[PDB]
Structures are given as C-alpha cells and as structure tokens.
Design a protein around this ligand. Structure first.
Ligand SMILES: Nc1ncnc2c1ncn2[C@@H]1O[C@H](COP(=O)(O)OP(=O)(O)O)[C@@H](O)[C@H]1O
Ligand SMILES: Nc1ncnc2c1ncn2[C@@H]1O[C@H](COP(=O)(O)OP(=O)(O)O)[C@@H](O)[C@H]1O
Ligand SMILES: [Mg+2]
Ligand SMILES: [Mg+2]
Lengths: 291, 81, 371, 186
C-alpha cells in the first residue's frame, strides 16, 4: 500500500519489518530476467511512459548489489526463524538428556517394578533378573488384571499413593524430559548446517561487495553465524549426552537411542498422568458409590 | 543375596508380565541403573503380594446353537403367523 | 471510473466500491415472503422482502435462500437480490460502472451462462468479471501461491494454487458449512428443551452460532471439562426476552467440520480434505502449500480454528518440514478485498469482458476467458 | 417373572402384562381436580380424579394433561398416573415385576433422567428399559426393517429402521398430533 520508491529504498536500507519469508520468496520468484533487464537498460525514452512494474524494476536495477541484498534479507529472516524454532527445542532436548541421566525417584520406581515383575514371573526364564530395558515402561500397561479394568501401572500408582507418595513427584523431575523433541533433530541439524553454510557464503560475498553492504549487514551475518555456532556446540553436547544416555540404559548407540527414548519416556509420562487420573476417578467413583 | 531377588512364591498361579530380560552381568555394570539398587542401602519398596494374589491370579435351559440376534429376529418373524 | 466488487456468497452478499478496504453493503441473501394474511390496507405492504428488511421483519416471513450449496437454485430471487444490492444499497447505475463478481469452484457451465446473461441483458454493465473465490482470497493474502480452504455457508472447498496456476484436478469440495452447522445446532438444542423449527428461528440460532460458538482445541478434553464443571456454560438473550444457557453446544457444533459423522456423512473432516488435496499436487510444490494454508469465509471465524487446524495438518503431514496457517483477521471479507485489489489494476483493463465481446461470442466467452 | 408393558402415551396410557396380545388397562392420562364448591359432608370425594374416574365425573372437573408434546410437564400428575396404573388398574407391586417403558425420539434428555429417577426411587423396579416407540411398532409388524410414522397424541415422528438399527440422523419430529387436531376441531 505504498509506492515503488518506498519499497525500493526499504530494500536498499536493509529494513525487514514488512519483509517476512513469504514476501521475499515471492520477490525472488518474481526476479527480473536477462532480456527484461537488457530491454529496461536499452530503454531510452521517458520513464513515466513505463508501467509501475517497469518503474519498480528500474528502481530495483538502480540499487547496487540488489539480488545479494535480497538474499541477505531472506537469509537474516530465515536464520532468525530457524533459531527461534530449533533452539528452544534443542534446549529442551539437552534438558531432557540431563534430567534423564540423573533421577531420584526413578531408581526406586524401577526397583519396585523389578520386584513386582520378579514376583509375577517367578519360576520362568525371565524371573530372578537384575533389570530390564527402558521399553518395559511402555509395556507396564499391557499386563492387566482379572476385572479388565486395572493395569499393572495403574495398580502400582494405586499402591504408591498410600505407601510412598514421593513417586507421585516423579513427573516433576521429568517435565524438562516431557514433550520430547516434537520433530527429528537430524533434519533441523541439516537445516542449521545449510543455513550456516549459506551465511558463511553470504559473508564471503558481502566481504567481496561494497562497504555500504558491509556496514549494513556484516554484524548481522556475524551474529547469525555466532548463534549457529553456539547451536552446533549445543548439537555436539546433545550428541555427547546421547552417547551418555546410550551407555546409561545399556543399549548400543548404533540404534536410535535418542528420539526413541524421548518417545518411549514421553508416552510413559503421559501414561503416568493418565493412570494417576484414572485411579483418582476410580477412588472418587468408589466414594460416590459408597455415599 | 540382593533385596529384589528375595521373592516369596505365590500359592496361586499369577498372570505373566512380558518383558525382555536383561542379563545379570550387564545390569550390574557400574554405569547401569541397577548397580545402585543391588546395594541394601537403597530404598526397596515392599510390594503387597496378598493384593497381587487377590487381583492378578487366574426352567430348563434353552440350549441354542445360534446367536441371540438371529434367534430374536426368527422369534419376531415366527410370532406373526 | 470506480468498479464494484460484489461477492454473491451463499451466506451474505458483500458489495462495495473498488479501490477500498471494506465493503459498504454487507447483507444476508434471503427473500422473505409473508405467510399470514394482511388486514391493514395500505402503507406499502410489499409481497417479497429482500435483505435487511427481510431480516428485521422476519417474524412473519418465510425466508428462502436463493443460493443453496453454492449453486444459484432460485433465479428470480437472485435477480431480486441483485436488484436490491445495486439499486437500494449502492444506489448506482449498472451501465456506468464495472462489476466484479465471484463464483465457487467446479461450478456448472450453464450457471455461468445464466449469470453472464443476467449481467449483460437485465443489469447492463460496461464490463464485468467472474473469478474464483479462493483465487481472490489468495490475492488478498498478498501471495501468488498457496492452498485456500474456503468455507462459506454451503460449500467448504479446497483449492491449491501454485504461482497463479489454480490446479483443477486437486480442487475438491465438501458440502458441509455454516448452514449445516446451524441445522445441527437446531437439532442438539432440543436436548436442552429449546425448540427452533421455523426459518425465522434459523437466524436466531445462526446468531447464537456467530456469537458464542468456538472450535475446541481438543474435543475429548472439552467433553471431560464440560461434563466435570459447568464453567463453560454461556447465556444468551433471545429477541422475546427469554435467556437460554448453552454448554457443550458451543464446541459440538463446529466439531462437525472435523467429524462429519455427527450429521451422518462418510467423508472425513476438512483436514483430510486439505491433505488429500495436497497429495494430488506435485511433490515439488507441496512444501510451499504447507506454509501457506489460507482460510476464507465466515465459517472460519471461530476463535480456536487456527491452532486446531495446525494440529490436524501437523498430525496428518510429515513433520520434517514447516506447517503454517495463514489466518488474517479480515479473512471474512478477503474475497471482497481481493476483488478490490484485482479491480483497480492497470493490467486488468485488458482482461475486462466488454459488451462487444458479449455480442460477438454470446454469454459463453467467460468459459474461454476466465479459468 | 412376568414383565409389564406400560406405554405412557401422551393421551392414553396402555398398560398390560407381557406375553399377551390385548393391553389390559387402556385409560386416558388425565388428572381431574374439582373446581366448584362441595356441599356434601361425608368425605369420599377425592381432591384429584385420575383416569376413567375423571372421565365419568368430568362435568365438575378441570382436566390437566401431564404430558404435552411427548414431554412430561407436571411430574406430580404423572406420578399419580403411574401410581394409578400400578396400584389400581393393573394392581401389581412394582418391586417384583420387570416393566418396559416407551419414549419418543429427540426428547430432552432430562425428561429421561427424571423418568429413570422416579422408576428407580419412587416406584423402584427390579429392572426396566426405555425404548423408542417406532422400533416397537416395527416389532409388532413381525419385520426387522422399515419406516414407522408414529403419530401419537403430542408428537408425530418419522423413524426409518434398517436391520433393527434405527438411523439417528434421519429421524424427524413434528409437534402436530391428535391434541392439536382436537383444538382445531374445537
Ligand atoms: N463471527 C462469526 N462467527 C461464526 N460464524 C460466522 C461469523 N460470521 C459469519 N459466520 C458464518 O459464515 C457465513 C459468512 O458468509 P460468507 O462466508 O461471507 O459468505 P457465504 O457463506 O454466503 O458464501 C455466514 O453464513 C455465517 O453463518
Ligand atoms: N378410533 C380413533 N379414531 C380417531 N382417532 C383416535 C382413535 N383412537 C384414538 N385416537 C386418537 O389417538 C390419541 C391416542 O393415541 P395414542 O396411540 O394413545 O398416542 P400416544 O400413545 O402417543 O398417546 C387419542 O387422543 C385420539 O385423539
Ligand atoms: Mg461467501
Ligand atoms: Mg403413542
């Protein structure tokens, strides 16, 4: 809702308020072609006779390094969007691994599950075992009673209400482990690596460009590359904590020991809260029936 | 000798919990979960085995070879005659 | 010369002058006929009330909708609607102003023939244009590409457009929109003991739907919250002074948009329609449509529809790429806003349909001219 | 034991025992309250006549219908109707006999809640069931599928039924039946 001169000066000035990802994608998809640029440069008549589209294209051609500037707009907004989506999720992943490696009520809980499982499978080959994998917590709801109403996990959280209620404070330690990652870390890692490569190429191009583009954009390029390097340091920390979590749960690191543990543990914490809710509903409905 | 392996046997037959058994040498590793739990100083919660035994243990009659729905439809069909 | 933009939607006709931001004349498309007997001789007892007069005096009027399921069924009623929106609302001569019009996707051709013949024989114009509603909504969103879920009063249609090319095979149509939600809301209010059987009561239930209903973010949690606590109950005052209070019906009514098995339709919700529209496109251009989910039509005015829609697509689509919902606040009039954008363009002078083109090529040049 | 069927219709209540083909107690659902001044001493005259007794002495009575358009308006009157059909017409103890009830489609649900509460608290039964009237009308015909137009005394409703399954969304209701025809004839 403004003239060609104002958006041309806004592109030249480096202002990104009215320029999000989609508008710059449309502008790059409506770039001028070679014969159009040559015909507008060979245009010698009065420029008022041209259309506003051709006048905007001549204003775009009047801007030095205009395509590189539009690339800088798109890469700055894209790098900001990628950091805003990836970095809190990667921080949640790092906090998830850090509070998965150390836990307080979880050894007591899994020791109690091992005692109950040794009681149930006594005399079998699986009994008299010193432990189990992390996938058994998903399999806790599978075993289910005579009345087909109470599972094993629901029974454990029923008896843990009366005996040792500190296990009910177990999801408090697991809330930064909760909600998992949401998306696969490798795909956004490749997106971050491609963005960092594009930003390094853009800084090399700006260093090959004029000093106006350098003073306008080099500090933003340096801040984006520094933030993406901090993100890559965070990814390397996530890889180190992934190897620590693989050695912690006694599983080899060649299999998916990062996202599968997050999904297994997220579904187990949701089953923890759901079993708490259904045992509260069972107690409340029994109290209502007694009244 | 560990606390969790001290299991009283059930009189009735119990329903089986299905899990993949970890080997005892792997679970007793120093980086494992279960080395801290094999010690007697850890808090081993006693399960109520009586409750688990209670809950997790194992006119002439009109004999028909048919389900109730088809018999219901046939009786509704026949009584209009 | 100022053009006219007039979306003749199923629900409400939205008209005004081109080059502007807001339509001056928004009014519902009903023709009201009196069903009782007149005794008071004189004072202009006109036999067929149209628009806002039919809305105001609706307690003695059988109301008829000329546009049913995006199809102009009754034609004399639609002519009366056009006569009221030109002569009484805008008060402009048609013969000195261009008139932009809108149309639903996958329309019958003879519908376009009849609309062209009315717009050139009865209401003579210098020029006019018929466009798809989703295309104008995408234009008012400011983007050339994207997928538009337009949900009006009768039709919820999904149209993906890539770089101005509206893909014809990937367009689909689901006959579930606002009037069906109003009829279902009539059906479920009888559980609370409120009876709404007349067509006059449809406007009251529609106003209840416009004012109080909202899209649930999770349906089962809202069932649990509604059955547990009566905190979400909301009261409404009827025009006779009575006050009703509705509970879960604020969000059971728009949930028909996600679960058509409530009213007994085998097809799935609008999310599956959007997703099956997306697999009908090329695999290169699917990425752009995920970030460009544009909505239009007033059935998208419920204030929980965007986050629920993003949740449903993100559940449906693979999570490797980005999902984004384009929901502007003025997407009710984005059909009209896109028409006002398209009407005042320098290029658009050469895509006008003149009277000479009409006389040479019948009322049939609209097929070969427009998409 | 032998079950009861009590079609608690909007104009007439039809009660009887199961296994039978003729309903034993067909009587209109009215409550007749006196309006004029009594001059006899000796008592005897009730303050509320229910059923055929209100029909016989109807020249000095205000008659109230408890059911209006398939909706029980006055629950005390309908309790009196239930008490009369359990204790006076059919003469059965409610707590030793199964009893089948009928209900019109698309009713308010709280009406069903209150009927369930009265049949499980006041006239508490060993068992009961509430079922759609058009389904039982189709069951009388000896067929499994078909459409039933049931036009009672308050509700005329259409129910199509396929293979014993009544299709819920296609059922429609019209508040025009025999009482409205009586008012129009009046
Ligand atoms: N604020 C609102 N909240 C919910 N629904 C609305 C609101 N405003 C309008 N609607 C519904 O959306 C429709 C809006 O009509 P519109 O989409 O502009 O044209 P049409 O539906 O006639 O093609 C109306 O039928 C109305 O039922
Ligand atoms: N022989 C008849 N001829 C015409 N109408 C009748 C006859 N018998 C009953 N009705 C009408 O039907 C009504 C009773 O219908 P009924 O089957 O009892 O409906 P409901 O069970 O819903 O009360 C009465 O009010 C009467 O007006
Ligand atoms: Mg519309
Ligand atoms: Mg009846």
């Amino acid at each position: 809702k403004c003239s060609n001169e104002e958006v041309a000066a806004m592109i030249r000035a480096g202002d990104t308020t009215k320029f999000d990802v989609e508008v710059l994608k449309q502008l790059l998809k409506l770039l001028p072609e070679k014969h159009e640029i040559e015909n507008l440069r060979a245009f010698t008549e009065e420029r008022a006779k041209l259309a506003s589209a051709d006048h905007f294209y001549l204003l775009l051609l009047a801007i030095p390094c205009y395509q590189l500037r539009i690339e800088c707009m798109l890469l700055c907004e894209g790098a900001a969007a990628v950091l805003d989506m990836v970095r809190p999720k990667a921080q949640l992943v790092l906090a998830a691994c850090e509070s998965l490696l150390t836990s307080r009520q979880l050894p007591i809980f899994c020791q109690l599950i091992l005692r109950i499982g040794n009681f149930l499978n006594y005399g079998s080959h699986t009994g008299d075992a010193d432990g189990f994998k992390i996938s058994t917590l998903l399999k806790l709801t599978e075993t289910k009673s005579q009345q087909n109403r109470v599972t094993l996990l629901h029974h454990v959280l029923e008896e843990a209400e009366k005996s040792h209620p500190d296990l009910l404070q177990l999801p408090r330690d697991l809330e930064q482990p909760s909600q998992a990652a949401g998306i696969n870390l490798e795909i956004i890692r490749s997106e971050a690596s491609s963005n960092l490569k594009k930003l390094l190429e853009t800084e090399r191009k700006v260093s090959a460009s004029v000093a106006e583009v350098q003073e306008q954009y080099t500090e933003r390029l340096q801040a984006s590359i520094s933030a993406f390097r901090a993100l890559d340091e965070l990814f390397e920390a996530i890889e180190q904590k992934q190897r620590e979590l693989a050695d912690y749960l006694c599983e080899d690191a060649q299999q998916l020991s990062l996202e599968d543990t997050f999904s297994t543990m997220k579904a187990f914490r949701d089953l923890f809260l759901r079993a708490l809710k259904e045992n509260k509903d069972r107690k409340e409905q029994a109290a209502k029936a007694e009244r | 000798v560990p606390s969790h392996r001290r299991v009283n046997p059930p009189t009735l037959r119990m329903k089986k919990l299905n899990w993949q058994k970890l080997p005892s040498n792997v679970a007793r590793e120093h980086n494992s979960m279960w080395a801290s739990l094999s010690s007697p100083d850890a808090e081993a919660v006693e399960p109520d085995f009586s409750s688990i035994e209670r809950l997790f243990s194992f006119e002439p009659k009109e004999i028909t070879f048919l389900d109730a729905k088809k018999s219901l439809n046939l009786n509704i069909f026949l009584k209009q005659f | 010369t100022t053009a006219l933009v007039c979306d003749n939607g199923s629900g409400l006709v939205k008209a005004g002058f081109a080059g502007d931001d807001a339509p001056r004349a928004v009014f519902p498309s009903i023709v009201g006929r009196p069903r009782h007997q007149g005794v008071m001789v004189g004072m202009g007892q006109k036999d067929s009330y149209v628009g806002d007069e039919a809305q105001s005096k609706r307690g003695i009027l059988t109301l008829k909708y000329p546009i049913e399921h995006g199809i102009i069924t009754n034609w004399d009623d639609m002519e009366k609607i056009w006569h009221h929106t030109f002569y009484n609302e805008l008060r402009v001569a048609p013969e000195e102003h261009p008139t932009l019009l809108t149309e639903a996707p996958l329309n019958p051709k003879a519908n376009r023939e009849k609309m062209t013949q009315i717009m050139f024989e009865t209401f003579n114009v210098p020029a006019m244009y018929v466009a798809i509603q989703a295309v104008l909504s995408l234009y008012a969103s400011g983007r050339t590409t994207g997928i538009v879920l337009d949900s009006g009063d009768g039709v919820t249609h999904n149209v993906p457009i890539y770089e101005g090319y509206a893909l014809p095979h990937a367009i689909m149509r689901l006959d579930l929109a606002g009037r069906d939600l109003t009829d279902y809301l009539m059906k479920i209010l009888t559980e609370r003991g409120y009876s709404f059987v007349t067509t006059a009561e449809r406007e009251i239930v529609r106003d209840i739907k416009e004012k109080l209903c909202y899209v649930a973010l999770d349906f089962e949690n809202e069932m649990a919250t509604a059955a547990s606590s009566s905190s979400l109950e909301k009261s409404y005052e009827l025009p006779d002074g009575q006050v009703i209070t509705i509970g879960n019906e604020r969000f059971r009514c728009p949930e028909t948009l996600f679960q058509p098995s409530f009213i007994g339709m085998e097809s799935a919700g609008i999310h599956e329609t959007t997703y099956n529209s997306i697999m009908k496109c090329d695999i290169d251009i699917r990425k752009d449509l995920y970030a460009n989910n544009v909505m239009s039509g007033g059935t998208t005015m419920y204030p929980g529809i965007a986050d629920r829609m993003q949740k449903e697509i993100t559940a449906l689509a693979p999570s490797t790429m980005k999902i984004k919902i384009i929901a502007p606040p003025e997407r009710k009039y984005s059909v009209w806003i896109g028409g006002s954008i398209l009407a005042s363009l320098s290029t658009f002078q050469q895509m006008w349909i003149t009277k000479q083109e009409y006389d040479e090529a019948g009322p049939s040049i609209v097929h070969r001219k427009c998409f």
